[PDB]
Amino acid sequence: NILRNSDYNLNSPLIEDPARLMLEWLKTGNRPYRMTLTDNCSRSFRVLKDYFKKVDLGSLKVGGMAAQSMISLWLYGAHSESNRSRRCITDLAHFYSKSSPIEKLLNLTLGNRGLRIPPEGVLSCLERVDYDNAFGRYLANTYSSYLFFHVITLYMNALDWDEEKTILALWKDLTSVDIGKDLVKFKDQIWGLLIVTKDFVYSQSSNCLFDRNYTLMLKDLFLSRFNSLMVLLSPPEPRYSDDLISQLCQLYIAGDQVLSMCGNSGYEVIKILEPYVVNSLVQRAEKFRPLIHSLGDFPVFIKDKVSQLEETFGPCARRFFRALDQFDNIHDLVFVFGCYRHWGHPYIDYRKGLSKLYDQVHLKKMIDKSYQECLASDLARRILRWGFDKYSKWYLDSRFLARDHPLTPYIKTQTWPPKHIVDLVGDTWHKLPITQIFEIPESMDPSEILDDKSHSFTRTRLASWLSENRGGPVPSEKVIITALSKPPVNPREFLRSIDLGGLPDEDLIIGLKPKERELKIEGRFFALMSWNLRLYFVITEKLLANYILPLFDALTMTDNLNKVFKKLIDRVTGQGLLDYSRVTYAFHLDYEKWNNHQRLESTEDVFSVLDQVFGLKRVFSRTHEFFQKAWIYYSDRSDLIGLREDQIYCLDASNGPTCWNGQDGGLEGLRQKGWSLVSLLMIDRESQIRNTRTKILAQGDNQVLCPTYMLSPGLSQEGLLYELERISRNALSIYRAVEEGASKLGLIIKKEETMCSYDFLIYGKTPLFRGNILVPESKRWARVSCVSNDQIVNLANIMSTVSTNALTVAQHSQSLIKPMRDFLLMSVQAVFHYLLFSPILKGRVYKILSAEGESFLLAMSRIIYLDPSLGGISGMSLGRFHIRQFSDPVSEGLSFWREIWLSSQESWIHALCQEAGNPDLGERTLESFTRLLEDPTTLNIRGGASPTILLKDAIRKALYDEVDKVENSEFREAILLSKTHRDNFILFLISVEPLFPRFLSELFSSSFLGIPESIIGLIQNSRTIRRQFRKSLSKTLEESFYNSEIHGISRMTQTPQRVGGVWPCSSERADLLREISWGRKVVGTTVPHPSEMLGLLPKSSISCTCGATGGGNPRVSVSVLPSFDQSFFSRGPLKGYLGSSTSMSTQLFHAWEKVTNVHVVKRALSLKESINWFITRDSNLAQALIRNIMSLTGPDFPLEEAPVFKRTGSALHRFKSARYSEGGYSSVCPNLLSHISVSTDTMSDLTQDGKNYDFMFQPLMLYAQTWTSELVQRDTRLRDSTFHWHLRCNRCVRPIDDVTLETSQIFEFPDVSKRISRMVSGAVPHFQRLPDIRLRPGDFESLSGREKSHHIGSAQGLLYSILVAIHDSGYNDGTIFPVNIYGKVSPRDYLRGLARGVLIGSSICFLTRMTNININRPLELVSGVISYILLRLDNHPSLYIMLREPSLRGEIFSIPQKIPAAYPTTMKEGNRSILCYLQHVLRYEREIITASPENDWLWIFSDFRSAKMTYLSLITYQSHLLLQRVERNLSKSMRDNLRQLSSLMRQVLGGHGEDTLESDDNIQRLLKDSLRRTRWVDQEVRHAARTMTGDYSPNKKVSRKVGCSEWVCSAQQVAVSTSANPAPVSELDIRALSKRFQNPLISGLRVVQWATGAHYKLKPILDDLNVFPSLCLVVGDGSGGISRAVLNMFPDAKLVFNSLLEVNDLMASGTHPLPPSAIMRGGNDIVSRVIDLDSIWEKPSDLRNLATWKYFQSVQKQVNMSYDLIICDAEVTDIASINRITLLMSDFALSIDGPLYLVFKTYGTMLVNPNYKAIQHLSRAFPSVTGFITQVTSSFSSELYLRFSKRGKFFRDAEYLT
Amino acid sequence: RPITYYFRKQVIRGNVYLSWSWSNDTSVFKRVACNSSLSLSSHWIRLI
Ligand SMILES: [Zn+2]
Ligand SMILES: [Zn+2]
């Protein structure tokens, strides 16, 4: 006799049948059988008769027409005023002003960070103009209507008379009551007189009637409008106009007019609004690069439909589209984009939509099959290539195959074939009988399957319910209840039964339900299936998502937001670049009913291939057979079913069908992944045959193609237009090909609706304008107070949705100040509503509102800012805006509060901080330690933790005392085992001394107890609880929530906790707080926050005063690029750095399902992987883990002989890449991050003594990125000033002091293999145990540098080449080539060792790539394989880092090497040089290696010492000796041994072979060749830097006895250049001079090249110069070159490099760039007589700015010297840049007093164009001039090196050229 | 000047062969109005 409400916001669909039926009942008769009988509706009908004995009944309106009146009414009153809205907004602004000081915290943290504060005031935004005006009357009426409807919905969703009495007690002068009946009236000057009759609403003035869902809709839209305009008001910067607010009021009124004079049918107009905005955005994009041809017919489509809707529907649509086109800005248009729901939702016509669906599904086609054959052949080719790559083993069976087929020899030899062979069989891979690859699990975790999905009925119960009932809608069964009733899943057996036919005719039912808030009158329909069918679909799609989707890259379904952004950036490079080097088109494809039109005959062969690879057949195929053989019905109407005992026989099937017994098609939300696969394969085929460099993005419906094209840097207009013509041609061709393929598969594509652009893109309502992720804010601020389903309206929940909405806004945006201000405002609004009324508390609060002066201040501050862990349970600290997935919120909060404490002088904030310091700890007993298992990094608190723990424990109680009433025996026994052993195992876990809590959590969830806890946390639905359990659980939970909110408000109004002085070094406080909470020392969780250990104020490299004095001060360097544009048109050159992000917090860019766990056995195996990190082998915890995995299996398990390595040199909060690791979320949009690089190599100083600091750099990088971007965009002058952050706390920095865990207590586990089958029996496949050989020791730290760097090199090469030969992801990771090892190593031996390692890696790749004909040519094979490895190594970036150490450079350039010409030395040239040295080592000096018998032993290291790499390494060495020990062709015995090695690596490297097939044959095959020729070490390479590697080997070599190398020059020629004012002009001179030719002969005779071969030209001028200048200023040049020659000629000379950086994305991730290679080629003396070489990038290079020249003057002042020479060699064809250059160079030379010589390179052609402004602009300090020409200059070129000279203080105001 | 590969063909007794020239007009041509690879010409000159 009691039910919950669970309905506040509009999540349900919308419908008109209830109102119609209630009207028919009110007119006359009994209830018409379809009315959802209850008590509420009965009493409502009673009162409704008692007031509808009037006469209005008979001309009443209903839903679908009722709105019509309403909206008109509303716009009328919205432009009328009242006396009520004044009071409301007056009180709201009073609340804000009472809450004004709150913002002080924000302003204080921004002033500590070093930024200005907006002075208008976010929080006093409702007192500038919000009254007595049109806009303030529309705002106040909107808010008042929202309040009205909120009160209405509260009265509706109340339960008892007491709540209604409470409500009327609160609102008195607004509401009225009539007792003796339940007759409640609500009046208002706008909306007249409503009569909310409990579950129904009636309007008299607007003569209509309706139900709750409409009230929720209107409440939601009014709230959207209000909060949107609110956050829109008072922003910091002029991002928007004010005519945005005025235009948006106009737009909303236009929509009102549309609705008021076109009915619900006018809801097609917003469906046109959205693409209209998109078209406007595109047409505003092309203006920047307007020279390319825009394709498609999108704008024509838009114009036609606007004219259509203007002719029909009246001129209202005209007004709407006019006001929509009124906008001009871009962000305003996006803000209009977000509000496609601010008008309402349409009353759907389910019959109409179902009729259209029936027709669209039953529409037969005449499609082809050969296309699908080719498509599936491509798929099988891809899957087999992947299989061979990862696991070097085919997946065929020659026993079933032919012989006149090239693959029987290419299978007898386990290889992969070349291009011409695959072309010979390009479309026949199906005729290959592909066998099983991916073993499926015999069980699965319930967290992946069970969910509140409203499982359907089956035929038996359906027929019985129809025979019993007389009508009404179906309530469907639930999933967890059905699961607890029936036995669990055994997918192997299930799919084998389906393989045998299976899925009998009974369980083939589907039910429909209309989707919610989709804005279509026809309405979408999401389905709910039966148990077996839903099981089939779910396990199938999860199976594909696990082991198929990772192959494809477009497939953006199982991906989070960060990875989405990474993919978009990768597929958008070439948008908004300012040049014509990267043109990327974007085709958005949106088919017509893709789901329905996807049909059987298409998906037969692709699905067949999937089914063969899983070892099944026809199973996937059967899908459409099920849709052919299945019933389909509609839930909200049952009386239409008339079943004939054989089929459906639907009734009333003339007005439109409702049900049917079969359909050739599919439905939305089902098999999205396979259908996406086939569509993607089509697209990829067509593109790859037309253009290979296409990228694809696909979730299944909103597909995106992106073809990229590169065009040369220097191109002329004719050629440019030719290129663009060919570009458009190819793009149109690909689009036509896609349409042809789609008509070949029945998928019709709308030609006039596919979108095309080149500077725009869309993905899932995420717009990307010119590479910039542009944000809609309106969706997210509209979702304020719109809590999710099956949740409670608690303070915590609404504040949490506010916070996460704002944080997702920030992740979609930049300029965090705006989302912070919006967070504040929306939070205050939400809490004002919640305190106006609290449902679960069943009354108003009265403790916070009545407060004044200070107490209300403390209350709000505690509500909003305090974290859930620190006393409060509602708010969040601002420190979560810096990073999102941080490992410890405690340190973040404490750092924030400390900064706010010492950065202030006020009183109450001190009290708040002291409260945050000592958060009122409580008991230290059991029933609290469990919290550490559900959410570590928390505190045992007096006042309870998040209600999740409370739900888990309450449901645990109900399930323990009602275990007997669950039918299943396995689940029953599992819960039985749970009860006892849970307490006992928690006791053991507390019995572990060091208390590393993450290990305990993973162990608790990894044992059998994770099963019940899993499902118990999977219970979150109130109706689920009411069905399964009884009123006890629900009542207990309600009372618990009551007590919890009471304690919450008591905490928010606690006593001020009088101050006790500030605290130092917050993280230390957190550690000791955990300590005094849980007694013992704690580790792991305590992680510092960069807000503490990087300081507040950064400083530019200039004017910092650190330099190199005081010591090796560490720092985090931030190189910003000059391309920084605060606007949204450039996207920068770079990619960005965001980090990784684990998808375990419901952030998948949609919300369909989650990925909580995988399995208990896999978690236990992960523990076994982490055995030796912090636990010893022969101990009690190792015994426990082995007992655990042996309990969850049989005692006959082939354990893996857990390893014999020791990563003692590592951290402890880097446990696993499962839940929290890889810190970093990049809360700010990456768009501005395209301008930034962030280096940490300075922090290498921290490892001067070692100590194993090993702290995470990613939070540092991210904090720096965020706040330096903010500090740049607030001051656009420092567009190139590299910053550097210094450390402030040293006590934050923590030496690891590695620790171990041990106990004396032992705990025995019970058997769970003979007690629970079907859950654990076969979850994980075989492991193929290998026998160990004890890995004879190393004895490593007894050698010198020159004796072991060879070993290090060989090890690195071996590991890299192995990780390349098997396609692991760790082939391109920086953990292999670290940077703390090049500074102290012998370079020659290091590189020769790399060569050795690469060679034996080539041995393994030879073992793999072994066909039947390549055997007789093995030497060329070895060479080519080495070349392949070297190619992949060229693709390795971070190797080029080794060019920082000068010793390595000297050794690598001692051999001839092609010198580059770019300053920012890239991967390409650096790796090319390294690989040229390696290729010179090989093929000249191979004899030196593999000889000198004490260089031959192979020392392996322990960076990847797992069983996998081990046997692979021994195999590589054996195969290397066997390729060696040979000079002539091979023998058959050698081939036999090699095939045995191939089989062995096949067995070890997973697959489906036998495990090893022997041990004695193994040892006999590897002994005497590898085992007694490896010397394994129990140590990692990095820490070797301690003992001997750190001891530098002084190079005691000098030279090679070569002569003095006398220097040389060449001829020259002088020319005159005079000047005067008038400057007349002739025509023939321009005619013969201004014609630029090009003919390279002498540019090729310029043999030497350093940057471009210019020193040849600049020898003679300086040889003529007669000062021997001490100080040159070289500018514009790329590298060395001219500068290097300057250093040659004048020994007593120094230099100022103004070489531009122009960084590219080919560099490393964080590290700083390296100096120009040319100068590092010079030598030590020449380099030291450069000023500063390792600090150039820290200096600016922007010639067009002034700071560069101020830096030059600063150098002149700091050094006791004065400039004498200047050189400018900037080649530019443009004009403005060189004009600026000359302006600033003139002001510079005017700011020099001493003698001066200047050299300017120029082209004679520009010397007569009057727009050059070079001589008349530069000749303002120099009287003396002479032009110079060289005997080496381009054969036809007007190159002049003009030399100016002065002696001091000459002005010569201006003089043109004569 | 722009680059214009003028293509044509010839027939010898029996079969045919192709022919190309820089200075002719037989009206089946491939043309490009930009070199964009003169650096390669200089490279070949340095090599030889
Ligand atoms: Zn600190
Ligand atoms: Zn500094």
UniProtKB/Swiss-Prot annotation, chain B:
Question: Which region is the signal sequence?
Answer: none
Residue window of the full protein shown: 2032 to 2079 of 2127
Job of this protein: RNA-directed RNA polymerase that catalyzes the transcription of viral mRNAs, their capping and polyadenylation. The template is composed of the viral RNA tightly encapsidated by the nucleoprotein (N). The viral polymerase binds to the genomic RNA at the 3' leader promoter, and transcribes subsequently all viral mRNAs with a decreasing efficiency. The first gene is the most transcribed, and the last the least transcribed. The viral phosphoprotein acts as a processivity factor. Capping is concomitant with initiation of mRNA transcription.
Name listed for the protein in its UniProt record: Large structural protein
Provide the assembly information. Answer: May form homodimer. Interacts with the P protein.
Family affiliation: Belongs to the rhabdoviruses protein L family.
From which source organism is this entry? Rabies virus (strain SAD B19)
What's the domain of life for this entry?
Viruses
Per the record, the gene is L
Q: Where in the cell is it found?
A: Virion; Host cytoplasm
